[PDB]
Coordinates of C-alpha atoms and ligand atoms in Angstrom, one line a residue:
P1 CA -46.0 -8.1 77.1
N2 CA -42.9 -6.1 79.2
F3 CA -42.7 -3.2 79.4
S4 CA -40.0 -3.6 81.6
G5 CA -36.7 -1.6 80.6
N6 CA -34.5 1.2 80.2
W7 CA -35.3 3.5 77.6
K8 CA -33.6 6.4 75.6
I9 CA -35.3 8.8 73.2
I10 CA -35.4 8.2 69.3
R11 CA -37.7 11.0 68.3
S12 CA -39.5 12.9 69.7
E13 CA -42.4 15.3 68.2
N14 CA -45.0 18.1 68.3
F15 CA -44.0 18.7 72.1
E16 CA -43.7 21.5 71.8
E17 CA -47.3 22.6 70.8
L18 CA -48.7 20.6 73.8
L19 CA -46.9 22.9 75.7
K20 CA -48.5 26.1 73.7
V21 CA -52.1 24.3 75.1
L22 CA -50.7 24.6 78.7
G23 CA -49.9 28.2 78.5
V24 CA -46.4 28.0 78.8
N25 CA -44.7 30.9 77.1
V26 CA -42.5 31.1 74.4
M27 CA -38.6 30.6 75.6
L28 CA -39.6 28.2 77.8
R29 CA -41.0 26.5 75.0
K30 CA -38.0 25.8 73.7
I31 CA -36.3 24.8 76.6
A32 CA -38.5 22.2 77.7
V33 CA -38.7 21.0 74.1
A34 CA -34.5 21.0 74.2
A35 CA -35.1 19.4 77.8
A36 CA -37.0 16.8 76.0
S37 CA -34.5 15.7 73.3
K38 CA -32.2 14.4 77.0
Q39 CA -35.6 12.1 78.2
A40 CA -35.5 8.6 79.5
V41 CA -38.1 6.4 80.6
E42 CA -37.0 3.6 82.9
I43 CA -39.2 0.9 83.6
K44 CA -40.6 -2.0 85.7
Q45 CA -43.8 -4.0 85.1
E46 CA -44.7 -6.4 87.9
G47 CA -48.5 -7.7 86.1
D48 CA -50.0 -5.2 86.2
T49 CA -47.7 -2.7 88.4
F50 CA -46.2 -0.9 86.6
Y51 CA -43.5 1.3 88.1
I52 CA -41.9 4.2 86.3
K53 CA -39.1 6.9 86.5
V54 CA -39.1 9.3 83.4
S55 CA -36.0 11.9 83.8
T56 CA -33.7 14.7 81.6
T57 CA -30.9 16.1 82.3
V58 CA -31.7 17.9 86.1
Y59 CA -35.5 16.6 87.2
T60 CA -36.5 13.5 87.9
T61 CA -39.6 11.6 88.7
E62 CA -41.7 8.1 89.5
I63 CA -45.0 7.0 88.3
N64 CA -46.5 3.3 90.2
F65 CA -49.5 2.7 89.5
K66 CA -51.3 -0.3 88.7
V67 CA -53.9 -0.6 85.9
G68 CA -57.1 0.0 86.5
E69 CA -56.4 1.9 90.2
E70 CA -57.4 5.6 90.5
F71 CA -53.6 6.8 91.6
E72 CA -52.4 10.8 91.8
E73 CA -49.7 12.1 89.4
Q74 CA -49.7 15.9 87.2
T75 CA -50.1 16.7 84.7
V76 CA -47.3 17.6 81.2
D77 CA -47.2 21.2 83.3
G78 CA -47.1 20.5 86.6
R79 CA -50.8 20.3 88.5
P80 CA -52.0 18.1 90.3
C81 CA -54.9 15.0 88.7
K82 CA -56.0 11.5 89.7
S83 CA -54.9 9.2 86.8
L84 CA -56.5 5.9 85.9
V85 CA -54.4 3.6 83.9
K86 CA -56.8 1.2 80.9
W87 CA -55.2 -1.4 77.8
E88 CA -56.5 -0.9 75.0
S89 CA -54.8 -3.6 73.2
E90 CA -51.7 -6.4 74.0
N91 CA -49.2 -3.8 75.0
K92 CA -51.0 -0.8 74.9
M93 CA -53.0 1.2 77.9
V94 CA -54.5 4.9 77.7
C95 CA -54.3 6.4 81.4
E96 CA -56.6 9.7 81.8
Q97 CA -56.7 12.7 84.1
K98 CA -58.4 14.7 86.1
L99 CA -57.6 17.9 87.4
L100 CA -57.8 18.1 91.3
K101 CA -58.6 21.5 91.6
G102 CA -59.1 24.2 88.4
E103 CA -59.3 24.0 85.7
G104 CA -57.6 23.6 82.4
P105 CA -57.7 21.3 79.2
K106 CA -58.4 17.1 79.0
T107 CA -55.0 15.8 79.4
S108 CA -53.9 11.9 78.4
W109 CA -51.2 10.1 77.7
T110 CA -50.3 6.5 76.3
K111 CA -47.8 3.5 76.3
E112 CA -47.4 1.1 73.4
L113 CA -44.9 -1.7 72.7
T114 CA -44.5 -2.1 68.7
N115 CA -43.5 -5.5 67.5
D116 CA -40.3 -3.7 66.0
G117 CA -39.2 -3.2 69.8
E118 CA -39.8 0.4 70.4
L119 CA -41.4 2.3 73.0
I120 CA -44.3 4.7 71.3
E121 CA -45.6 7.3 73.9
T122 CA -48.0 9.5 73.4
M123 CA -49.4 12.5 75.7
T124 CA -52.3 15.2 74.2
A125 CA -54.0 18.2 75.6
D126 CA -57.1 18.5 74.1
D127 CA -56.6 18.0 70.3
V128 CA -53.2 18.3 70.4
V129 CA -50.9 14.9 70.7
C130 CA -47.7 15.1 71.9
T131 CA -45.4 11.3 70.1
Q132 CA -42.1 10.4 71.8
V133 CA -39.9 7.1 70.5
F134 CA -38.0 4.9 72.6
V135 CA -35.4 2.5 72.1
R136 CA -34.2 -0.2 74.7
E137 CA -30.6 1.4 75.8
Ligands
RET1 C1 -46.0 7.0 81.0 C2 -45.5 8.2 81.0 C3 -45.1 9.2 81.3 C4 -47.0 9.7 81.7 C5 -44.5 10.7 81.0 C6 -44.7 11.4 81.2 C7 -44.0 12.9 80.9 C8 -43.7 13.8 81.4 C9 -44.2 15.1 82.3 C10 -42.4 14.9 81.4 C11 -41.9 16.1 81.1 C12 -41.3 16.8 80.8 C13 -40.1 16.9 79.7 C14 -40.0 15.3 80.0 C15 -39.0 17.2 79.5 C16 -39.2 18.9 79.4 C17 -40.0 19.4 80.4 C18 -41.3 18.5 80.2 C19 -41.0 19.0 82.1 C20 -43.0 18.6 80.1

């Protein structure tokens, strides 16, 4: 399918819960929740290869990967991790991360194109699932 595009968030649920699992304290959790309101995702997909720029008001970060090939990124709370993205279906991919040092909750993320033109992105820590919905700008 075509993940490429310029996505703006319309909904973001359970983000505060996820940052709690990772040890973020209350006052900074509320600030990150407000930051997530302004999130944009830019995707260039050529075949199996994705270039993904995730950004808020004061921060931007680039995730370049190929389906099936290990790469390195960070978790939602900054720790470096090895990642591997695989398809689940035609329009959904899931990424499993493993920490490069130490220990912590089991983190992962998914991205899915819907039949209705939305990009749905979920990030998980152990049992807790944050769900984020975007539309093309
Ligand atoms: C495929 C999409 C991915 C891997 C997106 C990952 C997004 C994040 C790690 C986002 C982090 C943050 C914000 C969106 C704003 C609030 C604070 C952060 C740093 C947890």
